[PDB]
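request received
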Amino acid sequence: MKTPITEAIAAADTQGRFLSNTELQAVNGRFERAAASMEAARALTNNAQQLIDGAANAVYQKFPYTTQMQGANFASDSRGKSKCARDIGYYLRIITYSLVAGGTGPLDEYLIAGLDEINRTFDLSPSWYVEALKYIKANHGLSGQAANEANTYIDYAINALS
Amino acid sequence: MKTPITEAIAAADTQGRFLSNTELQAVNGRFERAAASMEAARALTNNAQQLIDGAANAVYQKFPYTTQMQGANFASDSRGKSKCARDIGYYLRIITYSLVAGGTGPLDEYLIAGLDEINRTFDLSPSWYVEALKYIKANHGLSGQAANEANTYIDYAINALS
Amino acid sequence: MKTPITEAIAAADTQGRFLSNTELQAVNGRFERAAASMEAARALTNNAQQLIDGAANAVYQKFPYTTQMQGANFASDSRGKSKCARDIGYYLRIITYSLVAGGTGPLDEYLIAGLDEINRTFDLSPSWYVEALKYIKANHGLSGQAANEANTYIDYAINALS
Amino acid sequence: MKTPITEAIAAADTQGRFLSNTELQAVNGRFERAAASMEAARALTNNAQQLIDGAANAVYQKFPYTTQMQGANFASDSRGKSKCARDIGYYLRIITYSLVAGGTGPLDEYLIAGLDEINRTFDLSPSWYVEALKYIKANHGLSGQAANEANTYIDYAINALS
Amino acid sequence: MKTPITEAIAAADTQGRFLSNTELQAVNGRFERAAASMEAARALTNNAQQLIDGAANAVYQKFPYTTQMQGANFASDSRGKSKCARDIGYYLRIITYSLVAGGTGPLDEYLIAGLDEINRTFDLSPSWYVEALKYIKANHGLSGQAANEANTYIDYAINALS
Amino acid sequence: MKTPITEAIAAADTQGRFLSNTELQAVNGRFERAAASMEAARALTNNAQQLIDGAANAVYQKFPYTTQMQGANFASDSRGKSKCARDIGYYLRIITYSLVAGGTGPLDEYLIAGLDEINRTFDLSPSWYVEALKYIKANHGLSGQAANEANTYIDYAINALS
Amino acid sequence: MLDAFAKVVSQADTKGEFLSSAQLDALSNVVKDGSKRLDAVNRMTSNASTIVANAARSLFEEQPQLIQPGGNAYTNRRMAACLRDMEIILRYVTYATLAGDSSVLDDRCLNGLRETYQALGVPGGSVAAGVAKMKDAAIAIVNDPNGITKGDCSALVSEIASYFDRAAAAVA
Amino acid sequence: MLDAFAKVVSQADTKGEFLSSAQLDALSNVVKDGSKRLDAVNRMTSNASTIVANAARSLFEEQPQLIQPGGNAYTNRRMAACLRDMEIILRYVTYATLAGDSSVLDDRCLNGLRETYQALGVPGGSVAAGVAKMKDAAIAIVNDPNGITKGDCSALVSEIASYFDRAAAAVA
Amino acid sequence: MLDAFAKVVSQADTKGEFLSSAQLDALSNVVKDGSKRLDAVNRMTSNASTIVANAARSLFEEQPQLIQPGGNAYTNRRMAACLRDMEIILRYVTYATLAGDSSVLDDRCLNGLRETYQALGVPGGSVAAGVAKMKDAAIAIVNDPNGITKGDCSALVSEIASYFDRAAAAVA
Amino acid sequence: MLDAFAKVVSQADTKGEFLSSAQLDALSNVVKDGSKRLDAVNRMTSNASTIVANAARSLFEEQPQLIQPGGNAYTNRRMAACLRDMEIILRYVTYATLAGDSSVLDDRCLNGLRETYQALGVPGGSVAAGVAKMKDAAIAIVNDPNGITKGDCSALVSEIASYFDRAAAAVA
Amino acid sequence: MLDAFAKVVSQADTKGEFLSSAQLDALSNVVKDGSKRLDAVNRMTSNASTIVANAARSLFEEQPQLIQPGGNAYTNRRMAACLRDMEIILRYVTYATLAGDSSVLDDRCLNGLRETYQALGVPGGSVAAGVAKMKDAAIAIVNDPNGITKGDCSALVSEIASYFDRAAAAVA
Amino acid sequence: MLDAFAKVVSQADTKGEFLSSAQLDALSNVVKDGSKRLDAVNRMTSNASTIVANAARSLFEEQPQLIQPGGNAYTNRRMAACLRDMEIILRYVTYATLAGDSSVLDDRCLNGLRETYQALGVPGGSVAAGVAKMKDAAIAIVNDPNGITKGDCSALVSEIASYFDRAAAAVA
Ligand SMILES: *[C@@H](C)[C@H]1/C(=C/c2[nH]c(/C=C3N=C(/C=C4\NC(=O)C(CC)=C4C)C(C)=C\3CCC(=O)O)c(CCC(=O)O)c2C)NC(=O)[C@@H]1C
Ligand code: NA
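response:
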């Protein structure tokens, strides 16, 4: 898995060399940012259920046809509502993984790789998840660099969907 | 030239992507370490001439034949003593470049690349320069993380000679 | 541009050889199929405006929100309905190009290459164009092998959107 | 084995794609041509022994030294005459294979690959076999596109020998 | 042009190194063999016309059909006899080049490269030239290592034709 | 192992050829030189212990610090003197191997490959071994081409240390 | 690879024999039925996206452990690979249908697939269940009598089903 | 490539001199302002998709001949290439912003770009117009006082605007 | 490359227009004359070896400086390359004949050939003479009424001669 | 590979679970003790040449059969390869030390090494003896109280020792 | 690979010893007999085509099943591969003859050949019979007293025969 | 590349002529004088390191601007490239000396070297000065009467000097 530490190791290993002072400074950079990252991860985790429910309702509010139209890809029944809240929880959970890992590794590996193909295949609109992520950004209640960290990874997810 | 910033940019450019939060954290790691690096570079620069003169005398004392044997590679005459002091100043100056740059880029590009060929071709013993570098380490008068930064790059040069 | 003829030559040219009876039979197979292809091309061309306007209207009833929601990607104003009708006309026109050419070359080069990126970037849903293509399939009025030729290229475009 | 159908499959497989309408048209072109191809294959098979003996006699007339000169490569004895009638039967048999397959695959794989090396190594003159093939072209008794098919693969064999 | 010297240089250059004692010994081997090669080249040159006329006659006696059959590839007329004596002269002349150069470089570059294609295209039999070469071998009148040198290059040309 | 013979075979094997006359002359060149090479190898072998002791002493007297300074890389004790005499014996022994084999193969494979890394790692000065080699050159007492052969491989080792 | 014609040719060459009248007759019958064969390939190709997607969706509905966290098809990268395998098998089945011979499917797709799945931990029995779902959908599409000249495609349908069964048997 | 630190180091090595106290002071000030620089890069990176999309939409609104049939940005392949070019230029501008030096933008992006566009037929003047639209949006995002510690970023913003202006001028 | 169909479609896409009824009529006429075209390609291909060899023999008979020692076609390696060039040009002429368009011959064969010949010292004027000889032999083979349904191939023959003439002019 | 953070995250994703407050506390502690970790990596790295050279010298002192003619480390090529192996193992131990996880050392260095040495005839037991000498030297350097803030590095030293012991066990 | 000299050198190095006077004498004998060795290599090389062709012709006359339809040497591609194998073995035998040591023939030709033939279905017993035929013909060519200085090459011929027998035994 | 023998042969083949008796006599003289040529190559090769190092040391003595900071030969990477260039030219001069023809020097070393130096900013006049210093040292080493059979190498020394002068002229 890609993290600031394993990326530094992979770079040194590619060049067949010991870790450089540049890479040790890079890892301390992660160490220095970790306080803000962990604050964001704790808060997103503690309010995960309320954040997931609110994000799902925000999507339905913005795109009411998703609770209207018949179809396997929509949330007009109990099955589709469970699928949607499950998906949004996946986004939130993996964002906290990225905050804790110190990089987008978990997002890239667990969610973004193949994301385009999955949404195309199952007729899932990227705009739905963008709206859900925008809601999480607006309601995580963080400030300072904790909010910066949270918003950086949320924006990364939104970019992956745009 | 390799620096923590250009290494981050080069990594993103090889992958054809925008800079990652991992790479921004890496650059802040350099920014946080810079105060120790700059303190080391200041003390080494301010005492450069004394450090060069003392290091040369330390080599001449450890290896007395270098001041007696005939040959272009030794410092038995004024020409050879000038070459030696020049060389030692090169090491100190480029070490301060690395401290300022935040990595071994200057050492690697200006001195270490081709070092083994030059020492072999001109019959210069690496042990001579190891002794000079050991002198600088014991006489830079630095403490704490400023000493750590200076000794990291001095040890890096010593490893390149070993 | 890829056609059955240019594809046959390309295969022979890669092998550095003269055209074989395999490629001549391939080109004659195009020749035999052309009557059905030409008949479909004419009927889609002569009925284009009504097919285009019917397909756009088909999307609007299936997805009413496309004529109600605010946003550059929707058709709630004259600008967006001109965009949509233009898009559907692009699909129809290039389908007739493919029918005439004997393969998907025109569809592949002019429309499908980069299609996923354009729909993601401009937030256009592929299901919109699928529904439009389904209308054209159900309303071109063709029969026999002319309907086969038309439906094959319509289904090819629907596959590229799925 | 290369045939019009396997070549279409190989082309689609190379691009990792489903078969295209261009390739389906190419295969139907092979299907349409098969009537002439198979009529030629049947006529060549039904008259094989007469064509083989007549062709061998045509070579012996055109190049009388082949029945006079001594050596393993000539047909001055029963062993050499048997080798010659064998080879000519090989050519005829594999031409009917190519007709049945709808392409030069059988000729290419069973006979032409290594042909130059064998004729050089065993001191066999290509002109002998060209004459045998010219006799076959003149006496297969076909007309129309069946004669066209037969002559196309006979000419291909002559080209391989020239 | 490959010679024993240029091949030695090419091996050193390929390895980016100065010439080795192995290459110097290889060149002296050429120098030690040169006396035999020059004796052979002198004798073949001095009797060139007689050798060429006798070799051409040897081919006509071995394959008398070459003076009877009609066709551009045979020698039934003055044009064909001129062509054939020209060709045999080329073989003898380039064999002397190979003797002087100390390797098959001249034969390889001036004659053998493309030989198979030329004899196939113009319907010339390699057996004709093998017979001519066998005559030269039996009639050059050399002894000792001078005969070895000439025979070595004649056999090399015969192998290229076999 | 690289020798003039295995080099010739390797060249022919790279091009999938039989051995050429160039290669056979190369190998005879080695045979002709072998008399000088074997006479040099015998003399060096017969006086090996005297040359090794005299070479060690020659180094100790040119670089007196090597018998006085403390350190595992110096010959100030019996351990270091034994290591040095052992090394010089390795040089002389492998030089006779090269003379016997007719090329630098034994020196390249047994000694020179990795030489720079070993001298750097264990802090051994190449100038020490150059001096020992210069003693051997000055005291082997050979004349004529036998001396030329010995001096060639001694100079080869000297260049590898320079 | 071989098609139906190259298979007979290669067999005859091994015996050094001209094709018999029976073999020429059989191969002419392949040609006579060629248009039906092209419809079958065109119809499966034209519906490939829905054949794969519907079979995958049903597979996951029946086998939820595949898409639970930690399941073999969990994460989008693994889901994309699984959908890709479904499409790959469908692709090579349509190749074999065009060729009238399973060699291309066996040689370029099924050979080694079991060992690949074993090393990765892919549940091949679940792939086989997905393949069977693709089979039934493809057959129903091929045998749809709307928009086609009515006739007998029973032998073709049996042949196509046999290719799907070969794929299932290679991984089950 | 160069950053602000490497540029000073390289100039000093050419002269064989140690860095002066004023040069070390200037580089310490670069470090002091580094947090603001990291925000500028993060904010531009985090909004890259909308910066590119909105600039491109406005460019096509103002220059409709680019997207008419036969136009340079017509067909989805050429539209995707055009959008990619916008994103590429924005990408290297954020690189130069992190480095505090234009070298990476000049060397790896702009050098030879005009000749590439001229050989292709890409209207470089229209690219420049889109780059400037990207500048105004990116700067607005960097300058946003919402959700950031209030301070002076005017020198940083003038620098970033200069990289955009450099990019536009290299193709205009 | 382009064929007659691709030519029309590409120009219509540039104008953003459907094909007109008259353009569709002309393309249907291209198909109708397709059997004649296949015969021309088949007949030139089936006689490629004699077309090349006889033209080359005649060229060297008329220009003996080519084959005398020091001539450009002297040595078997250069003679082989010369024959290969003749076969290459004939090959691309048959390509253009099948396509009904000279683009493949212009783009893949003729473009830059004069420069290449100039640098090597190949006498392009002599190549053009060989090409014209190949043209005469190929036209006679194509236009031979023995063994073919009688009809008018004069337009196709003029087209084929133009491709040969185009090749000769590019190196003359 | 994994670091300490990726290990926890990967295991949690397999169960589909958010990290608990206790897991978050534990990873915060890893960050808190990170400065000590960086010193350990830097001290081993800064002394790599002497750690390798002294351990190898001691190894050959205790096992002279390795360096006598016919021995595995005889000739300078085999000596250099032996020294390289020493350095490779130390390098991957410093990687594992930075990561706080042995996975990079197992995956990219130790797995298959015994079989590689068996095929070559390298005495794995002697490699293990050299590895243990590097361990003792590296640990003494890491634990050296001079020139560093006094503290407790016992858990770190125990971790690093386990990495060296892991390498030795993989070849002994 | 080794020659006669490298063999003695490599064994001496393994023991760390100078070559003895007896070993130097024996290697001087190899050099003294080198002219005869070069003759053997030149004679075998100069007759390679007929050695291969005659041995192959005799093999197929003795084993007609090899060249019947379906036989391993049937078709021209397999016949050429068979002839190539004959030539490769002869080639490597001449290599070993020049070297005075079988190592090049074992390492680069014979090692793994039996298993290669096993996997392909090449009948190695027939290859071995072909090799013996090449041996008899090559020996008679080397032994031919015409056109060479009379002397004793019995040891050389026995060495050469041993290389042929080695090649045959590796595949029989 | 050519040697003395290939140059005459190539000229003869262009004329289609057998070598004359005077041409064979001249090449025989080249062979007779070949031992001196081998001595010259061996002597230059055996002293290559000191020829290069002494010429470079003298060059930097006389042109100290080359090794000042900012000079072309400053830093160890550029110094090593400079020493490499010296060795390369010496290497190719020894090549030309063995071949008795300058073609290998012109074709593989000197052609395009001035343009390379111009693009890089390498002072070609200083390279020429270094080459001249190598010439004098090499010529004196070749002409050393000690330890060699006394004779006349003046023509060979003039030839070697011309190769050095050729190299210097190509960059000066
Ligand atoms: C056990 C290994 C020894 C030990 C370690 C130790 N260090 C600290 C404090 C610090 N170590 C660093 C080192 C770095 N920070 C970076 O970013 C980098 C990469 C460029 C390095 C190499 C720093 C900055 C500190 C903090 C400042 C300081 O010098 O104190 C401690 C105390 C902190 C803690 O307990 O975690 C310790 C214990 N101390 C010993 O006694 C062992 C010998
Ligand atoms: Na994008």
